UniProtKB/TrEMBL annotation, chains A, B, C, D:
One of its GO terms (molecular function) is NADP binding. Residues 3-149 form the Glyceraldehyde 3-phosphate dehydrogenase NAD(P) binding domain. The keyword Ribosomal protein does not apply. Keywords: NAD, Nucleotide-binding, Oxidoreductase. NAD(+) binds at R12, I13, R78, S120, N306. D-glyceraldehyde 3-phosphate binds at S148, C149, T150, T179, T201, G202, R224. This is Glyceraldehyde-3-phosphate dehydrogenase (Gap). The active site is at C149 (nucleophile). The modification Cysteine sulfinic acid (-SO2H) is found at C149. The keyword Cell cycle does not apply.
Length: 323, 323, 323, 323
């Protein structure tokens, strides 16, 4: 029987999760909770400025029909304590509202038929997993976090490169595309659309949750830029083992054939950011721009769609934790 | 007597050089050569989408009157061999067309009253100087290059940090704003306005010209982004001496008080890119985003206006080489 | 004695109103109410991505000192019923929060020393005035609306052209720049940053409030575009009197010399949108693009900064209603 | 036998024409002339920042294989007098370089196997046709123009509305998206990427070529905006017959069912500009934003992709003139 999931929240990540989940034969979306009116929700599923058009229909009984999910109940309840996914017999909640990003808050979902919650964001006090990095450490936790799009891109690369060459230290800069991004930090009060905006983002702590040995050896920051969706991570690494451009390229390519198949990819075609809109990978390595200096240092860049790679991992994690 | 300069070319750098030079009492712009009609040239001097409005007038005899340069002869001759700055008695040519970026090509200017040429770009076979880095090595060369805006930003920082801590290696990434940017590299055939575009840029060779000891120890790349003017350089460095965030901050601040006064600045106000439009500095360090990891590694970011800092250095170099 | 005003709300319009009011010797800003911390508010006054840097200081007693307003009390009270501008003896409130855009809601300000409220937006059930159009009809109303930036641009032009040629009908399209814009209309749910977005905006009703005879003769719409601040209105008019391009140009120019001096301007210099960032005019006519067809029809375009023209009118209206 | 065409020039319109023609079973692309290297041309066919990825292969003999065109000879000859499409037996040239936009210049193609030329731009002294408007007036001319994307959008609407209601006069404003746009007009010297730019465009003359009775009754202008591809035309019309919003809607809808089937479409779904990227229609009417005022005036808006609608018409015209 397909895994019965419900999506809570229909911002960008929730909408992408709907699209992704609808294409998986081992998933049934049984319910969506949205603040939008039904026809607005249908509109936003069908039409997207970056991801294009998508087929979705309304059934006669005003459930939705999308891909393999032919009978999706639509709810509109803001209060998590009143919200009741029981009529749809949901087993896993994908928590995409941004309002309950903690263990205590999202635990309010655990009632009736619901067994598990995956939070689509970093979350306070919450066991955190990145698919391909530490997801096999999962041990039946009922509320988990899928981390951030940034960590989903950088943690796979760090793991691959540490296994090959042994990371001594690394500095990460994320060029974070935020046109579609819907703090004690004064720069967050300034116009996203007109500016490059450097931001601290808790890189060391994030990495520590999924790669505990590396957390203390890495740090970095983000530069928010006014383009949509496709972001880049730039890792500057110092290794124990000597490296060349070729050896770094070969280590990354080998990983994509094996342990990170379907999660990390290599671009050998010299493409640009817009070519990776809607890419399902967590990271796409820019093969020709790998460089080394001295014996022990390298720079590695990788693209990612900050919605679609993440959302593909979200649903991968739902299938995994359902077993 | 003020130094008699002529500006060849009225693209973005030539126009910025006009504006800069007009405000210096020790400079007289005696001539401008432009492919534009006279009233078009006047328009483009007065009105700029990023640098705002500027006072300029046309004299009765149809010379221009701008700041301290009250009698600017306007020429329109494409052929360097026919071009004759003699009627204006020009001594130094600021070569801003992009058509003669070599020692052999720009040497065609050396005739009549002209003694020296400064090329506003990297140039083949041409002695290269960055103000504050190696300009005191100047030894009466008649044709020189002022390098690139990128090297003008990164070379001062490398020099400061090497003097303080000894650079073992460094990796540089420039986030290059190219909305106002008027190769064997296929990515250059793609839409600048819609994409992040990674590009090789010959970092090691560029640094080697002005900091020969460091050239072999540094490399990097650029990511072209569709914002105007204000760029960022991100340096990831490994040092011989142990560093902290504080010690790096103090080394940079001390340099701006002394050896790099008027060339490098520090931002302690947590500003964003648009705040540095039209800045005269080669680099403005982002003080709060300096970070270290391990004992020996640091990341330093700095802003620059890719036209105005460079153009202020261009005119600084003209005053210097005139002695 | 200068007129004692307080600004409620420090979004874009409130910040622009602060800057404007600070430069008027007949105004004293006595208080600002803001949800921001004091140092954040100071930052946002001093630094603006589109309007540039502005001088502001903090006094020893932690009032603000800006231009002619040397002792500005800073409050932070969200609840209009608890908010008390009495300590600063404010007489007029400039209501810029967007939360009280009705006669009933903004009437909660009328207590203690406060005599009048000007709402910086269209407001339900509220007497509405556009400076230069109908402000001389003011008759001591204690709560008024300054309409919208769009109506402030279009209503002056309609008035001028109706007086000259007699408007039979007109169609208005506003190209509304919304990068800095902080409904039953599904298009409002789509990405402002990536799209041209056509929107109904109640043109006929808006015009009817300030030009009652014309309201029934005009309609139109807006197209929201992802550029900042500088908008354009495009009016297509059918007149009773025959017109030429020249006669329309002359009617507009004459009005700017007389009845609309300081409110409407003419651009004879063939400028582009960025040249009018921070312009104080309600509308700047694009003289060379006026056209006619047939005997009776014309098209007239005009620029405006959707923050600064409006905010200059807001303070003009405060001075006027204070008498 | 399929019609043998060759595409001269591989800018945006040439590349779109390749993609379009490759999907038509009654067309064979026999040759492409490009200044690009072969692998660069292949890259630009396969990867597009706005139109996405497209399947194309290189055959063993280094012809291209795209859709129904399995044997495309690739040439690289800049000189029209040396260029020889004979080896590929081309019958119709689609002239997309922008270098030969006149009857005299493009007549240099008429040699060897070539019978006809279609110029993908307005062209001096050249018979001009818009598909659906006047293409049935074609009478075996050997060199023709397909006009501009703007005229392809506006002329169909003018024809429909004139037939229904009789146009007395009209004013047209085109919001022309020019991020992907690769004069005596000083505004053309300013930064396209940062500005709204009003431009005269010879509307009356353009319309006169395809709708001679209407040319004298219409005029207008363009406003160039920094978004990609999807443009809007805004027509303000005065009619002899009385109109309502409903009657205008019905006239446009009826035309799309009949005389303009496949050329004009209606949007009843309240979509935004990005939803029409790569649309094949010359114009897509914005049904809900049609408005009238008085008895005789209306405003009609319509979207178009400024590359793809035009390129679909270009190939439609090639099939038509081949008969």
């Amino acid at each position: 029987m397909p895994i019965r999931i419900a999506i809570n929240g229909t911002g960008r990540i929730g909408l992408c999760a709907i699209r992704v989940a609808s294409q998986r034969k081992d998933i049934e979306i049984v319910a969506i909770n949205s603040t939008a009116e039904l026809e607005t929700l249908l509109h936003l599923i069908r039409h997207d400025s970056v991801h294009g058009h998508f087929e979705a229909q309304l059934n006669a009984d005003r459930t939705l029909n999308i891909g393999h999910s032919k009978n999706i109940l639509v709810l509109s309840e803001r209060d998590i304590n009143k919200l009741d996914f029981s009529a749809a017999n949901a087993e896993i909640i994908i928590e995409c509202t941004g309002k309950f990003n903690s263990l205590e808050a999202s635990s309010a979902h655990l009632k009736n038929s619901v067994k598990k919650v995956i939070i689509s964001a970093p979350a306070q006090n919450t066991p955190t997993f990145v698919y391909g990095v530490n997801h096999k450490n999962y041990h039946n936790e009922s509320v988990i976090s899928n981390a951030s799009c940034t960590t989903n891109a950088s943690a796979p690369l760090l793991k691959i490169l540490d296994e090959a060459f042994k990371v001594e230290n690394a500095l990460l800069t994320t060029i974070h595309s935020y046109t579609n991004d819907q703090h004690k930090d004064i720069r967050r009060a300034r116009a996203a659309g007109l500016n490059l905006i450097p931001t601290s983002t808790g890189v060391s702590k994030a990495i520590s949750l999924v790669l505990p040995h590396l957390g203390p050896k890495v740090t970095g920051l983000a530069i928010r830029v006014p383009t949509p969706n496709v972001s880049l991570v730039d890792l500057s690494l110092n290794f124990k083992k000597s490296v060349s451009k070729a050896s770094v390229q070969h280590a990354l390519k080998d990983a994509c054939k094996h342990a990170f198949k379907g999660v990390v990819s290599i671009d050998e075609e010299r493409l640009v950011s817009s070519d990776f809109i809607s890419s399902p990978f967590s990271a796409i390595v820019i093969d020709d721009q790998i460089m080394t200096i001295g014996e022990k240092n390298a720079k590695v860049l990788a693209w990612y769609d900050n919605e679609m790679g993440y959302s593909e991992r979200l649903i991968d994690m739902a299938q995994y934790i359902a077993q």
